[model samples]
Target: MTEEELEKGVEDFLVVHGKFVHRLAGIPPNAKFQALDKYITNQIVESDPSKEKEIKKAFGDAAKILRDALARNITTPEEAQAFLRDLGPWAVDLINTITRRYVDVIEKNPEGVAEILGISLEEVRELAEAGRRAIEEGEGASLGILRKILELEAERAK
Candidate 1:
């Protein structure tokens, strides 16, 4: 029961911050995250007053788990999956969210993704195709490839 509540809290936290994750270009701000935590908790309480105490504890756990994950400089899908798997089922939502948003952004603007990754448009197309193949094959090739590209960009920025 506690595990399920924690899972739900994590999912709620992720949903609350979905836009922030989608538009992430740099390290996320701690100040905003705290506010978001409060906001999500309030929203949950509004929806179910009886769950206030349980939700608060769950949210705290969710925030800590997310913060710890964010602190890691993981740039590979394999490592990302392994980390999340160890963290438990709620953490899985993070990988799916990140991968889906990354794909969505790249699909909309391949040129932008290429520029950030310092790769050619042709290379980006090849990468995209590979991602599609991996997805079709029930693998996380896209996440791996995209994470590499993102890691490169992050390193370049630093």
Candidate 2:
């Protein structure tokens, strides 16, 4: 929930999302601004208004719980699970960033997912454990778990 981890996570999400969006936006081999403008104006951008509601629904009560916390910027977390909620879609990036920056910790400590996520071991457990509670309680599924789900989705597409 602190700035470094969560902020870094948001940056990763935004950066990756931008890459995908731009690719889908159809930049040409010419890379001309005129081409970009034509593509945007020519395309009929119909969107589902329900997506935001769907996202909130996917997150459930926790979406409302952390929605405000993030907008004002993580001033606090009442409990450990709040930190987990802040993770949202950045779980895989968190682990990859940590592992890329500190490979030795992964090699040396079999019990270092905390290190891999840039947090204490208890915080790591809280992320994993709290997610299970969210699922069991029917509030929401843990966000970190969604990365695995998306990976399976990609595999099935092949």
Candidate 3:
């Protein structure tokens, strides 16, 4: 594929995979801040060519910032608000980086991309919607809903 095609492919891959992680995490469908750090770390570990070294480093950096914000358990509304205020932008950037890298690899090797990771275009779109919902609602809402969605998604893929 041409560079442009590869770029678009990478973008698409990011969008889909981002959604997949959101769904897998059981983050509420319409949450405001999906916990992408964990999801991104998991994807990096799972990706081919195992960019684990580089990805792990990135994840570690992102985690340190988030860890500080979350040190005070977010139980009350005020705590949640404070955590979101402090961590929002970081989360967004991390998500973008994670998704973009994922897409970059898949776009460059479409033929060799693993079937398990070959999330269909339609599915990717769905996952994007889910990501949107998680972002708009809140990460807390998305929790406990991931397993069912993943199972359903897996069944659909089959």
Candidate 4:
């Protein structure tokens, strides 16, 4: 996909609504991610089939990665906040430094992200897709770290 197409695909597949975030905060299992991913896949299949297969698989992979990661330790609002607070505000920069490079690689290169993180392109693609959304718009005051990282990346892009 072209950069613009990839951006749009990410927007459609990853951007979470505020209500979704609110609901997510109340849930215990993080299974809500599957609900969201399924919703995106169905929407893509229905309305946009040109890149539908790729985007659908990316969403599925991203959802699984997120579920597994979040399930490990950060499933609750209190836990998430404490983790972020413990990490401090500079966590934003740290996340940005790493995630932005991953985004850049996935967008323009991508060979190494796969090699470093996963054994296949699909796995790394999902990692990049899920992380790109998290950085750009994960929502909540508690998630400001991600938002901050996103702003820095946007500025660097310009």
Candidate 5:
């Protein structure tokens, strides 16, 4: 798919998933739902062409649901499990989309994209590998470090 198409697809997927999460968590499609939608749209608007926005947005949206559910004392073990199960496919699809988009950009302008991102194609490959490992292992410590790394990288990108 084209870049624009992928962006829109990611956004649409998040919207549907957000609603699903809210319903499953027994959130009453009220103020919390509105807040979730607003946050999601903001993330989408700020999305980069590289699909980082979508990836982060997906995680952020999921976290918000979890937070709201816990805060209101409405979440159950089964519901939490369901949320994580739903998140798994969402994350996989996001990573696939991101890898595809990054590969396409590199194929078209390997040097240009690499130079702009301040990382080599090899580094990009390594990053992807590390990400996959973290996801598979559910390594929260590693992920915490990765989150800080991403935060720094995003600052650099800006």
Candidate 6:
């Protein structure tokens, strides 16, 4: 393609991709990240095994930012996009740090996971491996598993 054609194509892709981010930013709190599920799936399907974790983590980061904005009721696309824009460089560092905290244990340290998640070290080991055991679910559905785990723990506490 000509340089002009390449530039146009790049700009078009950014527009479409930005629209996806805006839609995700505007997701309703009650909706359970349906848009993020599709977005993650589309990204992960092409990558290989080790790379899958990396891609999922990236999307997970984006999803969390969008989710946090929505949780605070940022429903307007303009507002949500602007929120991320305001985050600027910090957004990149913020998400990657969270992802690394979880992944370090998910890859190699149950005790670390326990410390970070406030769970028993034993249970941390179990869940880390269990991601492989239950590998067939949707992206955000696994997030629900976390919600259920928290609720179950709360009840157990009571």
- The global C-alpha lDDT for each of the candidates, from Candidate 1 onward, is 0.51, 0.33, 0.44, 0.43, 0.45, 0.44
Please give the clash total of every predicted structure, in order: 0, 0, 16, 0, 0, 0
Candidate 6 wrongly placed segments (more than 4 Å):
1-104, 140-145
TM-score of predicted structure 3: 0.36
Select the stronger candidate by lDDT from 1 and 3: 1
User: Candidate 5 lDDT (Cα, whole model)?
Assistant: 0.45
The list of candidate 5 runs beyond 4 A from truth reads 44-158
Candidate 1 at residue 94, lDDT? Answer: 43
What digit string (tens of lDDT, one per residue) describes model 5 on residues 32-140? 3334244334444445657565555554554445454454433343454454456687644543443343323334444543454466666545444554554444432
lDDT, model 3: 0.44
Between candidates 1 and 5, the TM-score winner: 1
Q: In candidate 2, what are the lDDT values of residues 1-111, reduced to their tens digit?
A: 343443344334333322322332333222222232222211211122444333223223333333433444332222323554456646333323322322222223425
| Model 6: pairs clashing at backbone N, Cα or C within 3 Å | none
Give TM-scores for every candidate, taking all chains together and pairing residue i with residue i.
0.38, 0.22, 0.36, 0.30, 0.31, 0.32
- Who is ahead in TM-score, 5 or 6? 6
The superposed Cα distance between candidate 2 and the true structure at residue 148, in angstroms, equals 1.5
Q: Model 4: number of clashes? A: 0
User: What is the per-residue lDDT of model 4 for residues 85-141, given as tens digits with 9 covering 90 to 100?
Assistant: 565665434334433543544445456443433235654455456556666663332
- Candidate 1 lDDT, 6-103, residue by residue in tens: 56665655544432332233344333333323433355544446765565565556456545655676544455467778988776764454345434
Per-residue lDDT of candidate 3, residues 103-157 (tens digit): 3443444343224334454444444445445444544322322433465455876
Model 1 CA lDDT for position 119: 66
